[PDB]
Design a protein around this ligand. Structure first.
Ligand SMILES: CC(C)CN(C[C@@H](O)[C@H](Cc1ccccc1)NC(=O)O[C@H]1CO[C@H]2OCC[C@H]21)S(=O)(=O)c1ccc(N)cc1
Lengths: 99, 99
């Protein structure tokens, strides 16, 4: 659907059989989720934001359903304060900014 | 215009007579710019992201032109690694997410 930005653009996501809320985040290159068990192989990685950097686990080719749209991509897991859906997955669900 | 997300959604802004590049950032509540002279009164403030917090100067009722759309609102100035246009200004230029 189309969404305005008067409130945080939070959507429901389903990943690893679990239901979560996550922020559609055009300022995030990558998707980063708070601590959870994703099954399979991962690689250590560091991502930076405002305030500095966090260590994350990088999981590749993970299936996520974002507000009813399925995407398969890289998910990072670590101590982000908020679940964020980044451009790597936004592109797959055909998400655009409009003004 | 309409903007896809294969690349960072970077736009030209004009603020305090200066031309800068800034990221349209639906994951940011606030607009935060890197160090610059904004004229007038400010207040100390702290904002948090991934990796922790930064101290910023809060300037109210600042005029910004974002990709040719004028907005007046709060601008935060501080050691963000990237100029980010947040929802406080995105709403004023009628910016929407669609998928
Ligand atoms: C994490 C969000 C809930 C909030 N952040 C906005 C977010 O878009 C930042 C915006 C951002 C962009 C660049 C550098 C720092 C912060 N992106 C970000 O942290 O993304 C990380 C995930 O992938 C990587 O892509 C870029 C940074 C990494 S934030 O920068 O911390 C932020 C917080 C509060 C305000 N008022 C403004 C911005």
């Amino acid at each position: 659907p189309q969404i305005t930005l008067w409130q945080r653009p939070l959507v429901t996501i389903k990943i690893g059989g679990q239901l979560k809320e996550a922020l559609l985040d055009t300022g995030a290159d990558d998707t980063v989720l708070e601590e959870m068990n994703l099954p399979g192989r991962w690689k250590p990685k560091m991502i930076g934001g405002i305030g500095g950097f966090i260590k994350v686990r990088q999981y590749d080719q993970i299936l996520i359903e974002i507000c009813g749209h399925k995407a398969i991509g890289t998910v990072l897991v670590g101590p982000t304060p908020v679940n964020i859906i980044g451009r790597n997955l936004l592109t797959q669900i055909g998400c655009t900014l409009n003004f």
